[PDB]
């Protein structure tokens, strides 16, 4: 009964019963299940014998940054008696722990290596040989002015958490086209079939001969060949269906197949698995002739065997390309004749001795343009260099790429699960990236199986994620109530009844004491029902506040629950802005950005992190007790929050972040920016919210109200204004240098099916906004023309 409880909890957590998997009687699903279960359990066991600092690295990974004084409050576990030391920002955490043990021995009338520093009320720790200034928490405290509050956790306490979290021939390829079709009975049904190796067509779309019931050799068919079908009417499309010619066991598939079709001509990128709705979906009846069994040649036997003329020169000096331009691998792989086994064996032989490639080259090889499993394994082999922080930075894209995957057991799934089971922060976001897509039939089996496998290697983490899902379940029930109620009573009345609903023990228990799905290190402790509310927008989003005594003012955390809108594009936009910030900070440029959390959790559902101490441009402009001129409202609000000496740092914070968001919204093509979706923090930091439109679905924007604040309220201020232009120019030139990184990641995101990231037209927008094909001088002059055009429009 220890397994019956665990399995039913897994079913509940992943949003799919484990019985649904068994009832498929699918040897592939069964073989992924048992192989991945052992893989995950091995990792769980390796983790149960790690050292206490290694366990800290696992569950609470360090939050770092991409000579000065510091007052720090430090206390111990099991004692309210705090102590305020005065350490330097250049000191290591071990120096503070020695200071704390010195003050502890002096009071209690009495070794810092057996201790770790916990950030109060958070699952965040400070340990290692890193100066305090470089820990994100100390950095954030220094800028905010706040005193860092830490707790001296001993090794015997950390080890108790580890001990509490236990458990053949030239015969040309041919098909026989032998069902619930719904189309105009007056016209006729036609099926178009195409052979594909990724994007590349292996031969030519062999269509069919024009009711409700209806040039390639077999020896040259590549390992990952796709037979792609399209049911049209004769141009109105009806359905599509794809399948792999070779099975998961490398054997060539033979005999009849029933292809359950997806409703819409050819969709090569679409999954190679049938529609699960085997009741209403249209089906195609096909037959695979008998070649003999024939299993795709092994690596041992395989290794034994731009204009048109430019591609033939790249292929001729293919060995010179490996030995002198190894990074040009994708250029030669994209020129290889994938419909000729003779050239594919010669090309795969080169890839077997090809040196490793930088992560930027590996992220390119993960695109759909490279479906070969050998070239794909080489990509994950180069992708292991990825640091846990870099892997987190691209985790969303690596999850979308699983949609291109042709079989369930794959080296990307093995890698993602291996890296997830070695870091609880990576296992956390991998969980939510898969959980949030469980309502999508095409990914539900794949994602459902991965989440199950992870759960086998993390039974304690499953219980922690269960607590999150229960909170999200209650938030949907409270949000549906709020939607119905708001259409029938005054807002104050609905707010009072939302609070009574929340005050029920079913809700107080479920909504309290959980890790935030937006950030596992933020602990959501007591829900402040008096401070919770909903916004007046269509989906009545909930504004939920939390407090924690243990963390003081830092435990005051807000989250926004939204049901009814897709949050993926917002998440993507924010991740890109965070990447820009990391790139800018890597080149010594801190633009004081605010890349707050956005995490989709389910069907048109997700969370948004509340940034407290901020208001919208429109609310500051309609102040609540004056400005003689509206142009002075923002500057006056900044004066209200930053008296005397402080006003200068606030105008600087505004200038830097304004330059960052001006460049980010410009480069990413984010339009429809107005006083409602632009906010200012009391520090001066300007940031944007609600990114429902990107890639021009856009000129540089210079708002007069912001230029007035940048100019310290002066009508003419070239010293201030031109320093601002320098920031825009630097941030735009740093992002241009990493243009290939955004293009590769955006190319990987084509797998997500976001409507504003659909064809090459959308990717072209980024190339033009980043002016990549130009020299750095010509691009900077072009940006200058578009920036000067924005000041005149201001």
> Interface residues with ligand H5I (CB under 6 A)?
535, 537, 541, 560, 562, 570, 596, 608, 610-611, 614, 616, 679, 689-690
Nearer to ligand H5I, 117 or 518 (CB): 518
The angle that helices 459-486 and 424-435 make with each other, rounded to 10 degrees, is 40
What lies within 8 Å, CB to CB, of 527 at 6+ separation is 502, 508, 511, 512, 544, 545, 546
What lies within 8 Å, CB to CB, of 381 at 6+ separation is 356
The CA distance from 500 to 507, in Å, is 10
Which of 186-218 are b and which e, b meaning 16 or more Cβ less than 10 Å from the residue's Cβ? eeebbbbbbbbbbebbbeeeeebeeeeebebeb
> What is the smallest separation between the CB atom of 668 and ligand H5I, expressed in angstroms?
15
> What is the smallest separation between the CB atom of 749 and ligand H5I, expressed in angstroms?
18
The CA distance from 559 to 517, in Å, is 10
The CA distance from 10 to 4, in Å, is 10
> What is the smallest separation between the CB atom of 533 and ligand H5I, expressed in angstroms?
10
Question: 567: closest CA among 592, 524, 618, 601?
Answer: 601
Question: 219: closest CA among 172, 160, 275?
Answer: 172
In contact, 549 and 120? CB cutoff 8 Å: no
CA distances from 555 to 311, 369, 446 (A): 60, 47, 37
> What is the smallest separation between the CB atom of 573 and ligand H5I, expressed in angstroms?
10
The CA distance from 291 to 44, in Å, is 44
> What is the smallest separation between the CB atom of 761 and ligand H5I, expressed in angstroms?
24
The CA distance from 156 to 133, in Å, is 28
Nearer to ligand H5I, 227 or 560 (CB): 560
> What is the smallest separation between the CB atom of 309 and ligand H5I, expressed in angstroms?
50
Nearer to ligand H5I, 152 or 571 (CB): 571
Nearer to ligand H5I, 635 or 679 (CB): 679
Nearer to ligand H5I, 333 or 542 (CB): 542
Long-range contacts of 14-17 (CB under 8 A, 24+ apart): 14/435, 14/438, 14/448, 14/451, 14/452, 14/455, 15/435, 15/438, 15/448, 15/602, 16/438, 16/444, 16/448
> What is the smallest separation between the CB atom of 611 and ligand H5I, expressed in angstroms?
3
Nearer to ligand H5I, 88 or 616 (CB): 616
E runs forming strands in 603-737? 605-609, 614-616, 678-681, 686-688
Per the DSSP assignment, residues forming a β-bridge with 256 are 287
What lies within 8 Å, CB to CB, of 365 at 6+ separation is 329, 330, 333, 357, 375, 376, 378, 379, 382
The CA distance from 563 to 544, in Å, is 14
Nearer to ligand H5I, 523 or 574 (CB): 574
Helix (H, G, I), strand (E, B), or coil: what is residue 605? strand
> What is the smallest separation between the CB atom of 616 and ligand H5I, expressed in angstroms?
5
Nearer to ligand H5I, 166 or 487 (CB): 487
> What is the smallest separation between the CB atom of 679 and ligand H5I, expressed in angstroms?
6
> What is the smallest separation between the CB atom of 615 and ligand H5I, expressed in angstroms?
7
CA distances from 396 to 139, 249, 365, 575, 695 (A): 27, 29, 16, 9, 19
Nearer to ligand H5I, 151 or 594 (CB): 594
Nearer to ligand H5I, 19 or 491 (CB): 491
Alpha helices (H) along 404-529: 411-420, 424-435, 441-456, 459-486, 491-502, 505-511
Tokens representing 531 are: 């401070």
Burial classification of residue 53, based on how many CB atoms lie within 10 Å of its CB (0-12 exposed, 13-18 middle, 19 or more buried) = middle
Nearer to ligand H5I, 614 or 703 (CB): 614
Count of Cβ atoms closer than 10 Å to residue 5 Cβ: 9
> What is the smallest separation between the CB atom of 194 and ligand H5I, expressed in angstroms?
39
Element (H, E) at 378: helix 373-382
Nearer to ligand H5I, 194 or 541 (CB): 541
Nearer to ligand H5I, 280 or 537 (CB): 537
The CA distance from 406 to 410, in Å, is 9
Nearer to ligand H5I, 100 or 560 (CB): 560
> What is the smallest separation between the CB atom of 670 and ligand H5I, expressed in angstroms?
12
DSSP per-residue letters across 499-549: HHHHTSHHHHHHHSSEEETTEEEEEE-EE-GGG-EE-SSTT--EEEEEE-S
Nearer to ligand H5I, 193 or 528 (CB): 528
> What is the smallest separation between the CB atom of 559 and ligand H5I, expressed in angstroms?
9
Which residue number has the CB closest to ligand H5I?
611
Nearer to ligand H5I, 613 or 737 (CB): 613
> What is the smallest separation between the CB atom of 649 and ligand H5I, expressed in angstroms?
21
Nearer to ligand H5I, 116 or 560 (CB): 560
Helix (H, G, I), strand (E, B), or coil: what is residue 338? coil
Count of Cβ atoms closer than 10 Å to residue 34 Cβ: 10
What lies within 8 Å, CB to CB, of 617 at 6+ separation is 634, 675, 676, 678, 679, 680, 705
> What is the smallest separation between the CB atom of 680 and ligand H5I, expressed in angstroms?
11
Kind of pairing between the strands at 149-154 and 69-76: parallel
Give the torsion through C-alpha atoms of 663, 664, 665, 666, to 10 deg: 40
Count of Cβ atoms closer than 10 Å to residue 160 Cβ: 12
Nearer to ligand H5I, 40 or 572 (CB): 572
> What is the smallest separation between the CB atom of 687 and ligand H5I, expressed in angstroms?
8
The CA distance from 719 to 717, in Å, is 6
> What is the smallest separation between the CB atom of 370 and ligand H5I, expressed in angstroms?
34
> What is the smallest separation between the CB atom of 560 and ligand H5I, expressed in angstroms?
4
């Amino acid at each position: 009964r220890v397994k019956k409880l665990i399995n039913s909890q897994i079913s509940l957590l992943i949003g799919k019963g484990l019985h649904e998997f068994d009832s498929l009687r699918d040897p592939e699903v069964n073989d992924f299940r048992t192989k991945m279960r052992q893989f995950c359990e091995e990792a769980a066991a390796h983790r149960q014998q790690l050292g206490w600092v290694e366990w800290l690295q696992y569950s609470f990974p360090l939050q770092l940054e991409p000579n000065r004084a510091l007052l720090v409050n430090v206390k111990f576990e099991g004692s309210e008696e705090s102590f305020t030391f005065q350490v330097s920002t250049k000191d290591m955490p071990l120096a503070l722990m020695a200071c704390a043990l010195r003050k502890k021995a002096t009071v209690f009338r009495q070794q810092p290596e057996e201790y770790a520093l916990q950030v109060n009320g958070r699952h965040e720790y400070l340990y290692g040989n890193y100066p305090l200034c470089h820990f994100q928490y100390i950095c954030s405290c220094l800028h905010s002015g706040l005193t860092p509050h830490l707790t001296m956790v001993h090794s015997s306490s950390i080890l108790a958490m580890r001990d509490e979290q236990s458990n053949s021939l030239e015969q040309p390829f041919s098909i026989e086209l032998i069902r619930k079709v719904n189309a105009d009975e007056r016209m006729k049904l036609v099926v178009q079939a195409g052979l594909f190796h990724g994007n590349e067509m292996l031969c030519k779309t062999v269509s069919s001969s024009e009711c409700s019931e209806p040039d390639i050799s077999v020896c040259d068919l590549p390992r990952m060949a796709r037979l792609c079908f399209a049911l049209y009417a004769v141009d109105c499309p009806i359905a599509w269906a794809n399948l792999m010619l070779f099975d998961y066991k490398d054997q060539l598939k033979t005999g009849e197949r029933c292809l359950y079709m997806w409703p819409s001509l050819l969709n090569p990128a679409g999954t190679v698995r049938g529609n699960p709705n085997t009741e209403s979906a249209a089906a195609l009846v096909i037959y695979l002739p008998e070649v003999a069994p024939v299993y795709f040649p092994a690596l041992e036997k395989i290794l034994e065997l731009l204009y048109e003329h430019e591609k033939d020169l790249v292929w001729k000096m293919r060995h010179e390309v490996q030995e002198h331009f190894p990074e040009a691998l994708a250029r030669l792989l994209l020129v290889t004749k994938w419909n000729k086994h003779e050239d594919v064996a010669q090309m795969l032989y080169l890839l077997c001795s090809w040196p490793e490639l930088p992560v930027l080259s590996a992220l390119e090889l993960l695109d759909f343009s490279f479906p070969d499993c050998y070239v794909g394994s080489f990509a994950i082999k180069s992708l292991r260099k990825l640091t846990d922080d870099e892997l987190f930075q691209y985790l969303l894209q690596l999850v979308q790429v699983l949609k291109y995957e042709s079989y369930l057991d794959c080296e990307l799934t093995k890698f993602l699960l291996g890296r997830a089971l070695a870091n609880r922060k990576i296992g956390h976001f991998l969980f939510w990236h898969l959980r949030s897509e469980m309502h999508v039939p095409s990914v539900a089996l794949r994602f459902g199986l991965i989440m199950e496998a992870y759960c086998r290697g993390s039974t304690h983490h499953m219980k922690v994620l269960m607590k999150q899902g229960e909170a999200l379940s209650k938030l949907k029930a409270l949000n549906d109530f709020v939607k119905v109620s708001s259409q029938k009573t005054t807002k104050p009345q609905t707010k009072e009844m939302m609070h009574m609903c929340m005050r029920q023990e079913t809700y107080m228990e479920a909504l309290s004491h959980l890790q935030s799905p937006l950030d596992p290190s933020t602990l959501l402790e007591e829900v402040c029902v008096e401070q919770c509310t909903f916004m007046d927008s269509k989906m009545k989003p909930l504004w939920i506040m939390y407090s924690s005594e243990e963390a003081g003012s830092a435990g005051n955390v807000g989250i926004i629950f939204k049901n009814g809108d897709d949050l993926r594009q917002d998440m993507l936009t924010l991740q890109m802005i965070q990447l820009m910030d990391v790139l800018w900070k890597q080149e010594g440029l801190d633009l004081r950005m605010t890349p707050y959390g956005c995490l989709p959790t389910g069907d048109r559902t997700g969370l948004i992190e509340v940034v407290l101490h901020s208001d919208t441009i429109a609310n500051i402009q309609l102040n609540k007790s004056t400005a003689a001129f509206n142009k002075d409202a923002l500057l006056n609000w900044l004066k209200s929050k930053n008296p005397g000496e402080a006003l200068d740092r606030a105008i600087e914070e505004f200038t830097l972040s304004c330059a960052g968001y001006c460049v980010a919204t410009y480069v990413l093509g984010i339009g429809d920016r107005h006083s409602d979706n632009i906010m200012i923090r009391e520090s001066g930091q300007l940031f944007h919210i609600d990114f429902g439109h990107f890639l021009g679905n856009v000129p540089f924007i210079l708002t007069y109200d912001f230029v007035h604040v940048i100019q310290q309220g002066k009508t003419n201020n070239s010293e201030k204004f031109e320093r601002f232009r320098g920031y825009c120019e630097r941030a735009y030139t740093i992002l241009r240098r990493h243009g290939l990184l955004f293009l590769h990641l955006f190319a990987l995101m084509r797998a997500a099916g976001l409507p504003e990231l659909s064809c090459s037209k959308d990717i072209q927008y980024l190339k033009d906004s980043l002016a990549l094909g130009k020299t750095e001088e010509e691009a900077l002059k072009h940006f200058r023309v578009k920036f000067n055009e924005a000041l005149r429009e201001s």
